[PDB]
């Protein structure tokens, strides 16, 4: 109804719902994720058999 | 101001040449933005091989989406493995920067391959015999 | 009845008694229920929920 966002937990163990809250202020969320490094690739091969 | 921004009087030949050869030219667009009205400034030509054109459809109908597919048509630009004809050095890092369509000045040729939207060079015709 | 000064015109109530109003049509009608939108049910922005 424009009041609450609706999302699905595709791995829900049984059946249930949870209500959360997040304010306009990103800090005001209860729970937060705070990355400083992500998805950085590593590439080479091992000379013992030269497999990648 | 624009042709001066591009230093046309000294570089128009270089910009055109790169474009002809590569068939795509892009420049980073400058804005203040606190006083955005005064923000246009000399722009930064971006390198081919560091830039990609990306569009997405966000809308849906039955048995396929047939409504306002606005596409957005934005760009991705990065540095990363800057080493080929020049032996470069860098450490490992993620990149993939998304740039709004409005944020970049760009032109390209009308030359496209058999499928997709892969834009080819004016020299494409010459690759076979040149080699 | 007991005052002779006029009938009740305001209500102070628990959150539960407001949520129940916000979720329903309080006017004269057949039946009515859904999301709590008729009154503010929060306390964060106000105390005053609305006029019943």
Is any Cβ of chain A less than 8 angstroms from the Cβ of C24?
no
d(CA C10, nearest CA chain A) in Å? 26
Helix (H, G, I), strand (E, B) or coil at B28: strand
d(CA A51, nearest CA chain B) in Å? 21
The experimental method behind these coordinates is cryo-EM
DSSP-assigned letters across all residues of B33-51 = SSSGGG-----EEEPTTSE
Is any Cβ of chain A less than 8 angstroms from the Cβ of C36?
yes
Chains C and A touch (3+ CB pairs under 8 A): yes
Q: Which chains touch A (3 or more CB pairs under 8 A)?
A: B, C
Smallest CA-to-CA distance from A20 within C18, C24, A28, A12 is with A28
Chains A and B touch (3+ CB pairs under 8 A): yes
Paired tokens of B84: 């080929």
Q: How many CB atoms lie within 10 A of CB B33?
A: 9
Label residues A12-47 b or e (16+ Cβ within 10 Å = b): eeeeeeeeeeeeeeeeeeeeeeeeeeeeeeeeeeee
* Pairwise CA distance, residues C50 & C19, whole Å: 12
DSSP-assigned letters across all residues of A1-52 = --SS-----TT-SSS--------SSTT-SSS----S---------BTTTTB-
Paired tokens of B107: 């032109």
Place of tokens 């997709």: B116
Query: What separation in angstroms does the CA of A16 have from each of A10, A12, A20, C28?
Result: 12, 8, 13, 35
Q: Which chains touch B (3 or more CB pairs under 8 A)?
A: A
Order of strands, sheet of B97-99, starting from the edge strand that comes earlier in the sequence: B51-54, B74-77, B97-99
Smallest CA-to-CA distance from C34 within C26, C22, C42 is with C22
Order of strands, sheet of B44-46, starting from the edge strand that comes earlier in the sequence: B44-46, B24-28, B104-108
């Amino acid at each position: 109804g424009g009041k609450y966002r609706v999302y699905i937990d595709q791995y829900a163990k049984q059946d249930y719902f949870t209500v959360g809250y997040k304010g306009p202020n990103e800090m005001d969320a209860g729970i937060y994720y705070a990355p400083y490094v992500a998805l950085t690739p590593l590439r080479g091969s091992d000379p013992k058999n030269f497999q990648p | 101001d624009v042709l001066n921004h591009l230093s046309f009087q000294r570089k128009g030949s270089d910009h055109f040449r790169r474009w002809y050869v590569d068939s795509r030219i892009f420049f980073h667009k400058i804005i203040d933005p606190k006083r955005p009205k005064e923000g246009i400034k000399e722009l930064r030509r971006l390198d081919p091989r560091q830039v990609q054109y990306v569009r997405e459809i966000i809308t849906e109908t039955e048995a396929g989406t047939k409504i306002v597919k606005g596409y957005k048509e934005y760009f991705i630009y990065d540095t990363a493995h800057e080493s080929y004809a020049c032996d470069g050095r860098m450490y490992e890092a993620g990149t993939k920067i998304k740039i709004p369509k409005a944020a970049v000045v760009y032109a390209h040729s009308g030359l496209v391959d058999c499928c997709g939207k892969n834009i080819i060079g004016y020299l494409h015709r010459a690759v076979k015999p040149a080699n | 009845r007991q005052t002779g000064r006029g009938e009740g015109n305001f209500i102070i109530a628990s959150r539960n008694v407001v949520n129940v109003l916000a979720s329903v049509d309080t006017g004269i009608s057949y039946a009515a229920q859904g999301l709590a939108t008729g009154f503010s049910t929060d306390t964060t922005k106000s105390v005053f929920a609305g006029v019943l």
